[PDB]
């Protein structure tokens, strides 16, 4: 099966309150496994999955140094963006980075990522070719020229093709017990009364891993979604996920509606009725 290593890094300026917030979290697939948090008691790169607790001090020390390096350059980047956009020094702004790698069953690289956002909007992204950049506006075009001239894509490509993939394999061995699992959804339809003409049918999917899932309602074979309510997939807190989808259906014709569930752990999809 395919797998992903991803880091999500957030810096937030807080003028008049002190130095920016800086937090980095790392995920293997849908499982978080590390963090660095500037606002912690003793900010340090540290495990957030039990199968990471056996890595030695050299791992945490080197990773801590790398996070602290980024903390410094995110501070600089926040100031530079403020200058690029000619913004007040008084307001709070956000700078985000996501990077990492997707690998296929053969565990070679399917896609490498290095992309950035300013105040929650695309700023600059390394393209799938790991050679060129997509700039989101003319400020980011300035960055693009600087990073092209500096040869940044080659630097990142070397990480993405080598280190990123090789450490992803190590993580997948360290967590072989829990990371390679597939928990199929336990699904059911629940009835609740609504109107006097209509009724709510809620299709539940529970306890599944990975998070990717498809829930759809259909009425006698075709499809329903333009008023079907569909909540975001949510963590249970125990490493599994939950989701539901509901339709309003007039009374007596509940039998007419089916919920369909698609998930990796389901050889064939589920068709469910109340």
């Amino acid at each position: 099966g395919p797998h992903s290593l991803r880091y999500f890094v957030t810096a937030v300026s807080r003028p008049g309150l002190g130095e920016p917030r800086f937090i980095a979290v790392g995920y293997v697939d849908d499982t978080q496994f590390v963090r660095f948090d500037s606002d912690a008691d003793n900010p340090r790169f540290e495990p957030r999955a039990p199968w990471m607790e056996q890595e030695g001090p050299e791992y945490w020390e080197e990773q801590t140094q790398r996070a602290k390096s980024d903390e410094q350059w995110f501070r600089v980047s926040l100031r530079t963006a403020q200058r690029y956009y000619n913004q007040s020094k008084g307001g709070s702004h956000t700078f985000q980075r996501m990077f990492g790698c997707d690998v296929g069953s053969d565990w070679r690289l399917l896609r490498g990522y290095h992309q950035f956002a300013y105040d929650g909007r695309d700023y600059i992204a390394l393209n799938e070719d790991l050679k060129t950049w997509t700039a989101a506006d003319t400020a980011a075009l300035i960055t693009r020229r600087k990073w092209e001239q500096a040869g940044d894509a080659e630097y990142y490509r070397a990480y993405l093709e080598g280190e990123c993939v090789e450490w992803l394999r190590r993580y997948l061995e360290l967590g072989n017990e829990t990371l390679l699992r597939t928990d199929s959804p336990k699904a059911h339809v629940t009835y609740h009364p609504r109107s006097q003409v209509d009724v709510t049918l809620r299709c539940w999917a529970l306890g599944f891993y990975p998070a990717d899932i498809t829930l759809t309602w259909q009425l006698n074979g075709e499809d329903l979604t333009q008023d079907m309510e569909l909540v975001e997939t949510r963590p249970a807190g125990d490493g599994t996920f939950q989701k539901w989808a509901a339709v309003v259906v007039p009374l007596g014709k509940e039998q007419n509606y089916t919920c369909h569930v698609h998930h990796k752990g389901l050889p064939e999809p589920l068709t469910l009725r109340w």
Binding site: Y7, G26, Q63, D70, W73, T80, Y123, T143, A150, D152
Partner: peptide
Amino acid sequence: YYSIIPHSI
């Protein structure tokens, strides 16, 4: 494995 950016935007 975390990897750094080398400089500013």
